[PDB]
Design a protein around this ligand. Structure first.
Ligand SMILES: *[C@@H]1O[C@H](CO)[C@@H](O[C@@H]2O[C@H](CO)[C@@H](O[C@@H]3O[C@H](CO)[C@@H](O)[C@H](O[C@H]4O[C@H](CO)[C@@H](O)[C@H](O)[C@@H]4O[C@H]4O[C@H](CO)[C@@H](O)[C@H](O)[C@@H]4O)[C@@H]3O)[C@H](O)[C@H]2NC(C)=O)[C@H](O)[C@H]1NC(C)=O
Ligand SMILES: *[C@@H]1O[C@H](CO)[C@@H](O[C@@H]2O[C@H](CO)[C@@H](O)[C@H](O)[C@H]2NC(C)=O)[C@H](O)[C@H]1NC(C)=O
Ligand SMILES: *[C@@H]1O[C@H](CO)[C@@H](O[C@@H]2O[C@H](CO)[C@@H](O)[C@H](O)[C@H]2NC(C)=O)[C@H](O)[C@H]1NC(C)=O
Ligand SMILES: *[C@@H]1O[C@H](CO)[C@@H](O[C@@H]2O[C@H](CO)[C@@H](O)[C@H](O)[C@H]2NC(C)=O)[C@H](O)[C@H]1NC(C)=O
Ligand SMILES: *[C@@H]1O[C@H](CO)[C@@H](O[C@@H]2O[C@H](CO)[C@@H](O)[C@H](O)[C@H]2NC(C)=O)[C@H](O)[C@H]1NC(C)=O
Ligand SMILES: *[C@@H]1O[C@H](CO)[C@@H](O[C@@H]2O[C@H](CO)[C@@H](O)[C@H](O)[C@H]2NC(C)=O)[C@H](O)[C@H]1NC(C)=O
Ligand SMILES: *[C@@H]1O[C@H](CO)[C@@H](O[C@@H]2O[C@H](CO)[C@@H](O)[C@H](O)[C@H]2NC(C)=O)[C@H](O)[C@H]1NC(C)=O
Ligand SMILES: *[C@@H]1O[C@H](CO)[C@@H](O[C@@H]2O[C@H](CO)[C@@H](O)[C@H](O)[C@H]2NC(C)=O)[C@H](O)[C@H]1NC(C)=O
Ligand SMILES: *[C@@H]1O[C@H](CO)[C@@H](O[C@@H]2O[C@H](CO)[C@@H](O)[C@H](O)[C@H]2NC(C)=O)[C@H](O)[C@H]1NC(C)=O
Ligand SMILES: *[C@@H]1O[C@H](CO)[C@@H](O[C@@H]2O[C@H](CO)[C@@H](O)[C@H](O)[C@H]2NC(C)=O)[C@H](O)[C@H]1NC(C)=O
Ligand SMILES: *[C@@H]1O[C@H](CO)[C@@H](O[C@@H]2O[C@H](CO)[C@@H](O)[C@H](O)[C@H]2NC(C)=O)[C@H](O)[C@H]1NC(C)=O
Ligand SMILES: *[C@@H]1O[C@H](CO)[C@@H](O[C@@H]2O[C@H](CO)[C@@H](O)[C@H](O)[C@H]2NC(C)=O)[C@H](O)[C@H]1NC(C)=O
Ligand SMILES: *[C@@H]1O[C@H](CO)[C@@H](O)[C@H](O)[C@H]1NC(C)=O
Ligand SMILES: *[C@@H]1O[C@H](CO)[C@@H](O)[C@H](O)[C@H]1NC(C)=O
Ligand SMILES: *[C@@H]1O[C@H](CO)[C@@H](O)[C@H](O)[C@H]1NC(C)=O
Ligand SMILES: *[C@@H]1O[C@H](CO)[C@@H](O)[C@H](O)[C@H]1NC(C)=O
Ligand SMILES: *[C@@H]1O[C@H](CO)[C@@H](O)[C@H](O)[C@H]1NC(C)=O
Ligand SMILES: *[C@@H]1O[C@H](CO)[C@@H](O)[C@H](O)[C@H]1NC(C)=O
Ligand SMILES: *[C@@H]1O[C@H](CO)[C@@H](O)[C@H](O)[C@H]1NC(C)=O
Lengths: 441, 130, 59, 130, 130, 48, 36
């Protein structure tokens, strides 16, 4: 005695997980924002009351899409630039000993070489300054990348500064944002909203230290796909930033030499004045209190009575072993030994200085056979950044001892994008539904 | 209750509401279904949105519910698909839970709707001859 | 989310006209009418309702 | 025969069947009409498919047959188009032979239906004006 | 009529005519709204035309005016939108001038229209429930 | 047979100096010239 | 630089024009999509 008939409702508020291509929106640069749809002046963010949605940062297609997009943009930016194929030659290199400090002995090499000119039948003897990490002995030297592949010089006009990028779904798709604070990144989220676009995410490239990122609104957040698994990276988000001042004090002089028809190679002619190592300063008290907060948060996962210590990086390439980043074109690799060196017992104006090495031959992404030459930046350079998070790895994991060792990590830039896209997911809307009703056709 | 305005919910503000409450916001969801690194991606996204919208419209048309947000049908609802009464359907759950519950029987209902529409069209054609 | 910002002179002379302006910034562009109102609280006293107006009519 | 079961024909199973019998499978055929350099080729293919589907939909709409699988029209059937009776058409030959037969008289019939629907909508507007 | 020519009314011919006279030539406008560097931009031109036509059709459908040139609706006309009289607008103003006049009230009218269509659909469902 | 229509009773404001058609034609012509010059020899060794 | 060099050498390399490609102007009609 029911007499219920099918009724079709078009436009019901129903969605489910889907994978699509999010397009870019922004308010000469490596990240091409000229082709992006301009952002709306007043973004629309609609709160979904009585909606609990399952989120998972570690299986988000948005991270993969952003990674692929960034690599594609980098390749596009490097496509219309000079290829340094003639640069692979025998180099007569001597040690730079003119006004240098004890910590800079042997880091720079004054290398002379023959090079092509505008005319095919003419050659020129030129000289340059090359960092020790860029040249390998065959007094006879050659560039490190010569036995791997050719290098494409980065064009001087395009700026390496990150620009905010907003990711927007097409019609028929929605982006759900988890407004719930203290969020683990995995599981239910009761406070959920829908946004036409994500917030401005600056594609900051860094290892062992998340720079110019987003800060937690309540307290330090620890996130891990499997915290009990030592093989899974741990993402730490700070509630407050730590100011870090990174500087190269050398007054580098850029001289451009003609290497072919319409092809110019920018070498480092000479350093005007004293030569000293580039370095990064960080406040000691701020770092200490941040580490204390991180230790207290980690104690919630690894027990209140455990011993938390921060130590060396395990090892590997210079990109993963040291904090790698870029400061206005110059690519820095900083020895973060003084930061992660302490132990904690479960009971002033001075600052920590990290020495840094500058590099010109670079490999941003985890690829072999695709390298880039960074033109030198004229004059002193300095930058100020906000350390807002960390990428950590747990060493060992045996239950014999009560101590836990955490070491800096990085290398994979997918984790860097994950720290910003943790609260965002993409779904496809299904406006068609069928329900039972007493109504009949 | 004297000095008060009025603000209307947005694209999916009715998702967590009951089916009856959400049935009044169908047009809001309906209107939003249509609107080299970035060029081809945008073009493919537009084509995909057009294809999805046209697929939904074609399904509605072959069910005889063309140009109707709410359209009754001649297909009876048997207890196999859902044993729940109307009282706890339209006043105690949302549409997302409905999609979760009856996701298995969607294709059967769609096929029954198609066959019912075909039978209705044939019956109408036969009657119109007289 | 609707946000309201108040502005006006911090000091006004006696027997003069006090002018206050409250601006409204709303992230939603669909047609909606709010009821705006002014509420003043004296130092150490309870709140007082001055008056209000609709956002779509002169009422 | 008791205990036989049932299986229903697929996309073009009724291609070689009679027109009257083939008229039961309209929905099945209807639902199947929508679903770097190779990216361009595939985009062209799917875009052209969408354009053809919209052409068919608008062609039906300009006759007033929107959303109807079977739609009757006021255009009389002139004898010279086909002198066969209804029994010989709907019970002794298929749709392919029919289309082959009336391939010559297709555009003129389409124009006749188009102008008939135009006259009908004009008359409806005039009637509703009063 | 033996000796007589054919003056075919043109596209946008009645743009400068009054609204009352221009409302009689809606067909000539509505009938043809859909129909290496060159091909790539021809593709997105086709896509733009298709999506524009589909959005217009969707807007017509969600108001309950699908497949119609003139559609009488149930929403009242608020005098605040325009204080002008019927004889004023329908005999001393063109469609372009009207669009310029009420360019800032289109969205509210569209929202009211779709809300009223949803209410009408709900009322029809309730009527069919008895 | 191009199909022209007179817009009787119509007046429209034109501005040739801010027409997007001119810019589009310029871009199209530049793109065509770039396309035509790609699939043939580049005279790099001629510089001697 | 009797010694001479092409004017473009110190600016950029030159691409030889395709020999079978003609430079004759051809009329072009710029036509908008539907709805325009
Ligand atoms: C985190 O965010 C902070 C704050 O935004 C970042 O710190 C900023 O870093 C940028 C660049 O990295 C820096 O801007 C530069 O400042 C200098 C002083 O004004 C300028 O030298 C420089 O302008 C030159 O470079 C631009 C391209 O980057 C060119 O567009 C411009 O024309 C200038 O280039 C001329 O000069 C150079 C040098 O002589 C020469 O080689 C060129 O050919 C050309 O002649 C930039 O404007 C900001 O000042 C920094 N802000 C602060 C507060 O420190 C920080 O880097 C971010 N961290 C990370 C990891 O991304
Ligand atoms: C690097 O080497 C070059 C050449 O060997 C040095 O340039 C010479 O500088 C001296 C002193 O200023 C001049 O007398 C020579 O004429 C220069 N030679 C050339 C070829 O330019 C250059 O000073 C060296 N730089 C450093 C930092 O040691
Ligand atoms: C640049 O090229 C010249 C010419 O080949 C090099 O000088 C030659 O060096 C070789 C090996 O030492 C000698 O056998 C030749 O006699 C030299 N020729 C001349 C003309 O000097 C020169 O060493 C090259 N420079 C660099 C920096 O590699
Ligand atoms: C580093 O962190 C500080 C503190 O969070 C940032 O200063 C904030 O800047 C924002 C800009 O959107 C303002 O709205 C806040 O009011 C500022 N806060 C404070 C306390 O001053 C600073 O912008 C950050 N710098 C970088 C480069 O990320
Ligand atoms: C998180 O990682 C731990 C450690 O690997 C997983 O537990 C292990 O599961 C494997 C499965 O074969 C067992 O062999 C190990 O003995 C387990 N080790 C411990 C310490 O329990 C655990 O399953 C992982 N969690 C999830 C959710 O995948
Ligand atoms: C990093 O800190 C060091 C000291 O730990 C700074 O070195 C001082 O630099 C100032 C420049 O204002 C000089 O006046 C001092 O004489 C330097 N002292 C020493 C001991 O070297 C360095 O400048 C700081 N760098 C940045 C970028 O802040
Ligand atoms: C990084 O540099 C900033 C300036 O860019 C330093 O901020 C200064 O901090 C001192 C306190 O020691 C204040 O007296 C100055 O007024 C600040 N300057 C500005 C411009 O605000 C900051 O201390 C530096 N941090 C480190 C770790 O070296
Ligand atoms: C790990 O810390 C240790 C000691 O603090 C560093 O080990 C030194 O490494 C250098 C270069 O390989 C050797 O010359 C020293 O003899 C080592 N010292 C000791 C005590 O073993 C090591 O460099 C640190 N790791 C990193 C990545 O900085
Ligand atoms: C990073 O810095 C640490 C601290 O200075 C370096 O460890 C030093 O290594 C030198 C060898 O050059 C030893 O003489 C010192 O005794 C070490 N110091 C400590 C505190 O252990 C470490 O080698 C640096 N890392 C790299 C890769 O150079
Ligand atoms: C979210 O759910 C709550 C209850 O779970 C809804 O509040 C109910 O509203 C109905 C009718 O609107 C009342 O009969 C109930 O008594 C209310 N329950 C409670 C606990 O107050 C609320 O309306 C829902 N929100 C939305 C936006 O749909
Ligand atoms: C295929 O053709 C055969 C013969 O042309 C059809 O068999 C006829 O079926 C009808 C009714 O369906 C009977 O009235 C005839 O007597 C049958 N004729 C013969 C010779 O058997 C058959 O139905 C057709 N099948 C399909 C699927 O089209
Ligand atoms: C443009 O204007 C003229 C008049 O200004 C319109 O012609 C009028 O048409 C109406 C209706 O047919 C007649 O009642 C008037 O008497 C006509 N006026 C004159 C002066 O003859 C004309 O129709 C308008 N253009 C178009 C294309 O409609
Ligand atoms: C350059 O200096 C380094 C480091 O002091 C030393 O190992 C190397 O032998 C020196 N080379 C010379 C003087 O050619
Ligand atoms: C290039 O040479 C370096 C050191 O000379 C060596 O470590 C590396 O494996 C070589 N790479 C290849 C591809 O041969
Ligand atoms: C976050 O995810 C972890 C991993 O499963 C889970 O155990 C934990 O309960 C979650 N936390 C919250 C607050 O939901
Ligand atoms: C670097 O050298 C140039 C040229 O000698 C000079 O103008 C400039 O001031 C120097 N910069 C610094 C920071 O000393
Ligand atoms: C660590 O100590 C706090 C008190 O400060 C206590 O609430 C907490 O439960 C302890 N942690 C665990 C895991 O028991
Ligand atoms: C590490 O800390 C120890 C004290 O535990 C100190 O002696 C040593 O110098 C520190 N090393 C660095 C690189 O800061
Ligand atoms: C190329 O050479 C010519 C003539 O010597 C000169 O006028 C011109 O400025 C030069 N251009 C460049 C880019 O060097």
């Amino acid at each position: 005695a029911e007499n219920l008939w099918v009724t079709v409702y078009y436009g019901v508020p129903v969605w489910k997980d889907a994978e699509t291509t999010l397009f870019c929106a922004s308010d000469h640069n490596v990240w091409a924002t000229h082709a992006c749809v301009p952002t709306d002046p007043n973004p629309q963010e609609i709160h979904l009351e009585n909606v609990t949605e399952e989120f998972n940062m570690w299986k988000n297609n948005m991270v993969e899409q952003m990674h692929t997009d960034i690599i594609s943009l980098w390749d596009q930016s490097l496509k219309p630039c000079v290829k340094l194929t003639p640069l692979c030659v025998t180099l007569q290199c001597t040690n730079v000993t003119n006004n240098i400090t004890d910590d800079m002995r042997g880091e720079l090499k004054n290398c002379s070489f023959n090079m092509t000119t505008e005319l095919r039948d003419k050659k020129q003897k030129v000289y340059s300054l090359f960092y020790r990490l860029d040249v390998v002995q065959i007094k006879e030297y050659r560039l490190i990348n010569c036995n791997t592949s050719a290098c494409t010089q980065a064009c001087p006009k395009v700026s390496f500064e990150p620009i905010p990028i907003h990711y927007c779904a097409p019609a028929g798709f929605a982006i759900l944002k988890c407004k719930d604070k203290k969020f683990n990144g995995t599981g239910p989220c009761p406070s959920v909203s829908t946004v036409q676009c994500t917030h401005g995410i600056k594609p900051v490239v860094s290892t062992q230290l998340l720079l110019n990122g987003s800060l937690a609104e309540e307290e330090v957040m620890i996130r891990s796909e499997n915290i009990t698994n030592n093989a899974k990276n741990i993402l730490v988000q700070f509630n407050t930033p730590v100011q870090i001042n990174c500087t190269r004090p050398n007054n580098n002089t850029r001289k451009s030499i003609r290497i072919g028809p319409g092809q110019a190679f920018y070498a480092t002619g000479d350093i005007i004045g004293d030569i000293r190592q580039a370095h990064c300063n960080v406040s000691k008290a701020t770092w200490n209190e941040t580490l204390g907060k991180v230790v207290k948060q980690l104690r919630k996962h690894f027990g209140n009575n455990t011993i938390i210590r921060f130590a060396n990086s395990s090892g590997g390439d210079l990109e993963v072993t040291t904090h790698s980043f870029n400061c206005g074109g110059e690519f820095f690799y900083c020895n973060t030994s003084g930061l992660f060196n302490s132990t904690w017992i479960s009971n002033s104006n001075d600052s920590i200085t990290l020495p840094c090495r500058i590099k010109q031959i670079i490999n941003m992404w985890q690829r072999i056979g695709q390298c880039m030459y960074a033109p030198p930046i004229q004059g002193v350079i300095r930058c100020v950044s906000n350390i807002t998070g960390l990428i950590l790895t747990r060493d060992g994991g045996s239950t014999n001892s009560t101590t836990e060792t955490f070491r800096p990590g990085g290398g994979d830039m997918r984790d860097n994008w994950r720290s910003e896209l943790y609260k965002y997911k993409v779904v496809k809307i299904e406006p068609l539904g069928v329900a039972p009703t007493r109504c009949k056709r | 209750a004297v000095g008060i305005g009025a603000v209307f919910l947005g694209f999916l503000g009715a998702a967590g509401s009951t089916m009856g409450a959400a049935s009044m916001t169908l047009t809001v969801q309906a209107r939003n279904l249509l609107s080299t690194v970035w060029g081809i991606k945008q073009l493919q996204a537009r084509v995909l949105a057009v294809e999805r919208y046209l697929r939904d419209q074609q399904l509605l048309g072959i069910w005889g519910c063309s140009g109707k947000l709410i359209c009754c049908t001649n297909v009876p609802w048997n207890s196999s698909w859902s044993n729940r009464n109307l009282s706890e359907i339209w006043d105690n759950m949302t549409w997302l839970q409905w999609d979760k519950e009856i996701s298995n029987y969607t294709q059967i209902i769609y096929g029954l709707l198609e066959e019912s529409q075909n039978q209705q069209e044939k019956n109408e054609q036969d009657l119109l001859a007289l | 989310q609707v946000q309201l910002q108040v502005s006006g002179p911090g000091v006004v002379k006696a027997s003069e006209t006090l002018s206050l302006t409250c601006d409204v910034s709303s992230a939603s562009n669909t047609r909606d009418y709010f009821y705006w109102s002014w509420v003043r609280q004296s130092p150490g006293k309870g709140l007082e309702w001055i008056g209000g107006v609709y956002s779509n009519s002169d009422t």
